[PDB]
A paper describes a structure:
G-quadruplexes (G4s) are highly stable nucleic acid secondary structures that can form in guanine-rich DNA or RNA1. G4 structures, in turn, comprise G-quartets stacked upon one another, stabilized by base stacking between the layers. Their stability can make G4s impediments to numerous cellular processes, including replication, transcription, and translation.
To better understand how G4 structures are resolved by helicases, the catalytic core domain of CsRecQ was crystallized in the presence of G4 DNA that included a 3′ single-stranded (ss) DNA loading site. Surprisingly, the 2.2 Å-resolution structure revealed a product complex of CsRecQ bound to unwound G4 DNA rather than a folded quadruplex. The RecQ/G4 product structure was very similar to the RecQ/duplex DNA structure, with a root mean square deviation of 0.68 Å among 511 Cα atoms. As was seen in the RecQ/duplex structure, the 3′ ssDNA is bound in an electropositive groove across the face of the helicase domain and it extends to dock in the ATP binding site of a symmetrically related molecule. Moreover, the helicase and winged-helix domains were closed around the unfolded G4. However, electron density was only observed for the three 3′-most guanines of the G4-forming DNA with the rest of the DNA apparently disordered within the crystal lattice. The 3′-most guanine base of the G4-forming sequence (G21), which is the first base within the folded G4 that would be encountered by the 3′–5′ translocating RecQ enzyme, was found sequestered in a guanine-specific pocket (GSP) on the surface of RecQ. The GSP forms hydrogen bonds with the guanine base using the sidechain hydroxyl and backbone amide of Ser245 and the sidechain carboxyl group from Asp312 of RecQ. These contacts are uniquely selective for guanine and, strikingly, they substitute for all of the hydrogen bonds that stabilize guanines within G4 structures. The GSP is capped on the 5ʹ end by the hydrophobic portion of the Lys248 sidechain and by Trp347 on the 3′ side.
Residue numbers in the entry: 5 to 516
Write the structure that this text describes.
DNA sequence: GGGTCGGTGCCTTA
């Protein structure tokens, strides 16, 4: 029968949307849902995510409920559908009671064909009761990765949508998202109760995006230099904390660079104005927390900067994926400091042990492995998402500037010697002063001139040496014990490196 | 030389 349903779908594709043909995989997804099967759609490339549920919604007789994470997303999606003559509506707190009653009346009557709604509203026990007295044709959960990303802590009603799926077993369910690795895919199936879903995964390759990493040495200065080299094209700078995004914004506005902070601490209409100025290109740069995310419709973001490393590869992929949507060259730049990773691990140890923390820890660890990789950045991303590839890309920082290594036994002995010289007590900021024998008070107030480690490594610049110590921490030769003021202690692997018995190769740092 | 670093959003009708 399959041919009959697709022709009805093809007609909707042409009549209400004006498009000519289905693109590869669109037909197979729409076919599946039109014959009653559940579906999980992971579409990082393709741009036809919304059509995958909106077209079967218009072919099926009955109501389609679209679960949506953001009020602004609901409104934008409803607006586009009404512009196409489709009877779409949404429900949210910003409406009046009279407005909501009219939406619900249209739902009972069937005037409304697609209803956009947040999980917190839909999962109310009495609301689900009134659903039974409608003609429900399909449920589609947009940005379904929220089920897993938020359903366990931030917004628990995202994990309750399975209760809805169990209440209406004969109504097909769709989960659709742009970013999801294997763990997230199975979690969506599990928490949503999809019954043997068709799983369709498109490619994660964005050839026009250039993945770049720079080691954080003087962060603000490097961030200043990178932006001033962008010569006024649009971009986003992500940081962790609201305080940081507010500070950095003011520093760039101190130069005359068009830049504005964005975070959830700002009143909402401020958020709408910054998002709108940015999108109409009257604002060059947005400094932002993760709050600046879903629903940003801007085709010409030319750079996305991560001033702080994200928590997992999915977040990094989704965030860098906002760049170069027009297909023209764009750049992703990550300012990496291993200290930011250890800060992220603390935040994780701060939470309850168990399987959820085990996964968050592995996701974090994989992100740190992406940052530390001495191989094509694109090969790490693609394979992490299960898309097998071995050919390096030629458009990452590893491919364009291959790593170069030098014998570090000399420099690492000079460093490993000077860190034992303090008896495990100084931090990295202290220890690197003695290796370049700069003149200051505690190198005499404690008496740290009468060591031959003082003034031994002025030969090379400051970035070179703290890079060495970071490399030794990564190899397990030095620890950073933050339980005693970030002092560098020495481990048991340190021994053969001071003796010169073990060979050692170190990479030069990432610098522009 | 400076994060002393968390951060994401629905929904309120006793
Ligand atoms: Zn590459």
């Amino acid at each position: 029968e399959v041919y009959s349903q697709e022709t009805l779908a093809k007609q909707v594709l042409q009549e209400t949307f004006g498009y000519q043909q289905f693109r590869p995989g669109q037909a197979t997804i729409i076919d599946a849902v039109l014959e009653g099967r559940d579906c999980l759609v992971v579409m990082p490339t393709g741009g036809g995510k919304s059509l995958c549920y909106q077209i079967p919604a218009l072919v099926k007789t009955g109501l389609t409920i679209v679960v949506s994470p953001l009020i602004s997303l609901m409104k934008d999606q409803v607006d586009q559908l009404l512009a196409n003559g489709v009877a779409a509506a949404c429900l949210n707190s910003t409406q009046s009671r009279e407005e909501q009653q009219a939406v619900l009346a249209g739902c009972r009557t069937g005037q409304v064909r697609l209803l956009y709604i947040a999980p917190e509203r839909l999962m109310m026990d009495n609301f689900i009761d009134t659903l039974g007295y409608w003609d429900l044709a399909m449920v589609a959960v947009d940005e379904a990765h929220c089920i897993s990303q938020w359903g366990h802590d931030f917004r628990p009603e995202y994990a309750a949508l399975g209760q809805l799926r169990a209440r209406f077993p004969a109504v097909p369910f769709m989960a659709l998202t742009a970013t999801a690795d294997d763990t997230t895919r199975r979690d969506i199936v599990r928490l949503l109760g999809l019954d043997d879903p068709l799983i369709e995964i498109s490619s994660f390759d964005r050839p026009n995006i250039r993945y770049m990493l720079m080691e954080k040495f003087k962060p603000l200065d490097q961030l200043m230099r990178y932006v001033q080299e962008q010569r006024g094209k649009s971009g986003i700078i992500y940081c962790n904390s609201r305080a940081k995004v507010e500070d950095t914004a003011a520093r760039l506005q101190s130069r005359g660079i068009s830049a504005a902070a964005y975070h959830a601490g700002l009143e909402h209409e401020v958020r709408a104005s910054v998002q709108e100025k940015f999108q109409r290109d009257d604002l060059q740069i947005v400094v932002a927390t993760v709050a600046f995310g879903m629903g940003i419709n801007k085709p010409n973001v030319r750079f996305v900067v991560h001033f702080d490393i994200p928590r997992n590869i999915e977040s990094y992929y989704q965030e860098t994926g906002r760049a170069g949507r027009d297909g023209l060259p764009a750049e992703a730049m990550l300012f990496y400091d291993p200290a930011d990773m250890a800060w992220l691990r603390r935040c994780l140890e701060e939470k309850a042990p168990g399987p959820l923390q085990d996964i968050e820890r592995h996701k974090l660890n994989a992100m740190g492995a992406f940052a530390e990789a001495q191989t094509c950045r694109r090969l790490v991303l693609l394979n992490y998402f299960g898309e097998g590839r071995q050919a390096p890309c030629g458009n990452c920082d590893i491919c364009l500037d291959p790593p170069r290594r030098y014998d570090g036994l000399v420099d690492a002995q000079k460093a490993l010697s000077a860190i034992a010289r303090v008896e495990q007590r100084f931090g990295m900021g202290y220890v690197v002063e003695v290796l370049r024998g700069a003149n200051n008070q505690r190198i005499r107030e404690l008496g740290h001139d009468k060591l031959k480690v003082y003034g031994i490594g002025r030969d090379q610049s400051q970035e070179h040496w703290v890079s060495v110590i970071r490399q030794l921490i990564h190899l397990g030769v030095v620890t950073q014990n933050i339980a005693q003021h970030s002092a560098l202690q020495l481990t048991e692997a340190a021994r053969p490196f001071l003796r010169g018995e073990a060979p050692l190769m170190l990479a030069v740092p990432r610098v522009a």
